[PDB]
Every structure is written in C-alpha cells, then in structure tokens.
Structure 1
Amino acid sequence: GVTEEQVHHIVKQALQRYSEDRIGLADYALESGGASVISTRCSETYETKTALLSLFGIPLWYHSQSPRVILQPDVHPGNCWAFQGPQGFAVVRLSARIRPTAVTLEHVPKALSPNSTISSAPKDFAIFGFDEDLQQEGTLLGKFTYDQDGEPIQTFHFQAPTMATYQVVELRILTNWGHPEYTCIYRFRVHGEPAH
C-alpha cells in the first residue's frame, strides 16, 4: 500500500529524470555543449536527391542531413545521419577531455517508424579513443550491439574501462539491422569523468 503522497514523489522524480536529457548523465559529445564531428573517414553519405527546396517553382537546393546531427538532440523520424552500407564512422572531439565510462546510442522508436520496424538502425558497433590526434592508432574502449527490440535509447557501460582520458573518440558502426541501402544514426552521446 502506497500513499497518494508517495505516488506524487515517485512521479516528481521520474519527470525530473525525464527532463534531465532522459537519462540524467552529462553528455560530452553534445554539440551545443562544445563537441563536434571532426571526421567521417570514408563514410559515404547516402544521398537520395529527394528533399528539394524551391521558390516560385524554381528548384534551389536538395536538403540532406549532416553528420553533425548525431550530436543534436532533435530525434524526430528522419532527423538522423544516413550513410551507405552497414559500415560507417564518426570521429567526435568531446567538449572536455574525460575518462570515458559509457556511451549512449538511440534510434527512432518502432512505434513511429513505418511498418513498425527499424532495419536502418545500427546493430554492432565499437568505440575507440584517440590519446591526441585522430591519425595515431585508436584504442578500443568497447564493442556493443544496439538492440532493435530494446528501448529506443540505450546506454552502454564499458566493462573494466581503463583510467586513460580522451578528448577524441570514434564511433564505428559495423553492421545494421538489415536495411539494404543505408544506416541511420539518430543520436550518439558520450559520458564519463572529467580531469579532477
């Protein structure tokens, strides 16, 4: 038996957690906080030549999603960086040098996707740390799989992370969930502990 008052408090706490970027963890990869995509290696943007901007009927411009969007909070359907194939890369300079402890990856939920499936979602992926530049050899921090049957937002704690700190990390997508032309990345976050 729970009182009305306890219900209120439980609701209050859940909404405060909801309002703290859903998961309550600072994101060192958030663009507005000072992070950016610095390279995509040889990732080939999947360009469809479909979203056409025009005025008085004059074709002006084809819009497509920048890699930058993976560090942007708006994750409505279609607001994702799409690359060709199931193999892609994004190198991110974090907003502060940290010891990384977890990353988060999300995708649009099935309920909002057509046919209720998300085969364009990343599946297996890995995270690498770069101690200085992005040309030296990456150190693997973790390998993980984004689960298409889990929550749209999934957090991934490194098992036995070292004490090394990094300001450059790379998200590598290895496979996807079956989509034959592309892979969509909605948002990638990186969490950890700053220099203390």
Structure 2
Amino acid sequence: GVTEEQVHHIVKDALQRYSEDRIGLADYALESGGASVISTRCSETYETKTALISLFGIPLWYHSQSPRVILQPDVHPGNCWAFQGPQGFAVVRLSARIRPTAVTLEHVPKALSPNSTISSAPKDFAIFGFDEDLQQEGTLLGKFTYDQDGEPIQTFHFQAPGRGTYQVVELRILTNWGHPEYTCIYRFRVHGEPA
C-alpha cells in the first residue's frame, strides 16, 4: 500500500497545482497580467435589461457583463460574457507576443446550475492568430470542441503547432450546447512560449 508520508506528499502536490490557477500554466490572456479585449472587434453584448443599478431607490442604469470578463478569474455563475445566439467572437490583445501552444476554456460546473445542464456553454470553437497586430484576416491555429460532459476547465493543445508568434488572437464560437437565446463565456486563457 502507501505510507502516511506518501499520502501527505500527494495531497501537498495536488493543492499546490490547485493554487497555481488550477492548471499550472501561465495565462497571457489574463487581464490583470496585461491582456485586454479589442471591444470594436467583439460580438455585440447580449443586453437583457433585467439587472438595474440604482441609488437611494432612484433608477440609474442597467448592469451587463462586458467582454472583459472572459479575461477575469472569477467564474461564479453569471460572471460570464454573453452574446446573442450560438455564433460569436472575441478578439484579445495578449499581454505579450508569444508562440501559442494551448488554450483553456472553462464553464460553470453542472452541479452549480439548475437541472444540472449548461446549454449556454460554447461547443465547437476555433482560435485565430493575427500576425500583424492591425490585420483583419486571421490564421487558423486550431479547431476544438468544449465537452459539456467533461471537466469544467478544459485545456486544448495545438495539435501541430506552427511556431510563429502572435499578440492578437480571436476566440471564434461556432456552436453552443443548445441554449436558444445566448452563449455564455466564463473564461478564456492562452498559453505559450514568450520571446
């Protein structure tokens, strides 16, 4: 069997990986590290008018989540960017120019969702890189599928990665898991090798 000291080592290593942003890979799309969205190059935000911000009871304005939130680590239910329908896109200026090796997408767990269903999750998606920061025509880096029956956090490795560098990338959502009104993106990460 295993010894007591061995069990403690296994637990220590597991919690250290947990504390390293769960997956232990640097994220060049993290907003606090220097990444940002290019708002004019994202899908229109799904505006719902169900959340009202006020002062002293007097109405003010509606509350909605902007594309910035896909670059932010809080992923409690509703801390997600929504666009209308099952196709949408977001363009991100990474914090540094890198050779991308993987991306990570996550969604809220089924256990924290009504009826244990996450139909607003992205399904098929594609990642594009823009060699020149201001060019409008991107290069396909990879196509993947977020598995609604998989772990909440899923990492996707570029199958045959072609080592040039990029600082501007696009997350293009092609389908969702069946929600008839919107698609929700909780957090998008980009991993790779710096210069």
Q: Distance in 2 between matches of 1:124 and 1:14?
A: 30
Q: Deviations over 1:68-92 (max 9, x none)?
A: 0000000000000000011111110
Q: TM-score, normalised by structure 1?
A: 0.97
Displacement of 1:60 in angstroms is: 1.1
- 1:140–1:67 CA distance, 2 compared to 1 (3 A): same
Deviation at 1:56, TM superposition (A): 2.4
Root-mean-square deviation (CA), in Å? 1.0
Deviations along 1:42-77, one digit per CA (max 9) or x if unpaired, are 612111101111222211111100100000000000
- Answer with 57-66 or 77-86: which moved more: 57-66
2: CA distance between counterparts of 1:38 and 1:159? 27
Contact 2:101 2:192 (C-alpha < 8 Å) held by counterparts: yes
Distance change >3 Å, CA 134–CA 39, structure 1 → 2: farther
Structure 2: runs of 5+ lacking an equivalent = none
Tell me by how many angstroms 1:115 deviates: 1.1
CA distance in 2, matches of 1:68, 1:40: 12
Q: Is the 8 A contact 2:42 2:67 kept in 1?
A: no
1:124 aligns with 2:124: yes
Q: Deviations over 1:165-196 (max 9, x none)?
A: 1001000000000000000000000000011x
> Does the 8 Å contact 1:52/1:62 carry over to 2?
yes
The CA distance in 2 between the partners of 1:134 and 1:65, in whole Å, is: 26
Can you list the C-alpha shifts for 1:135-186, whole angstroms capped at 9, x where unaligned?
A: 3320000000000000000000010100111001000000000000000000
Would you say how many aligned residue pairs link Structure 1 and Structure 2? 195
Q: 1:5 to 1:32 in 2, by over 3 A?
A: same
- Give the share of equivalent positions with the same residue, in percent: 97
Q: Is the 8 A contact 1:118 1:148 kept in 2?
A: yes
Deviation at residue 40 of structure 1 after TM alignment: 5.4
**Offset of residue 114 of structure 1:** 1.0
Q: Aligned partners of 1:38 and 1:44: how far apart in 2?
A: 12
Structure 1: gaps of 5 or more residues: none
> What SS class does the counterpart of residue 68 from structure 2 fall into?
helix
Aligned equivalent of 2:163: 163
- Tell me if structure 2 keeps the 8 A contact 1:40–1:90: no
Distance 1:70 1:60 in 2: 26
Q: Is the 8 A contact 1:40 1:89 kept in 2?
A: no
| Secondary structure of the corresponding residue to residue 40 of structure 1 | helix
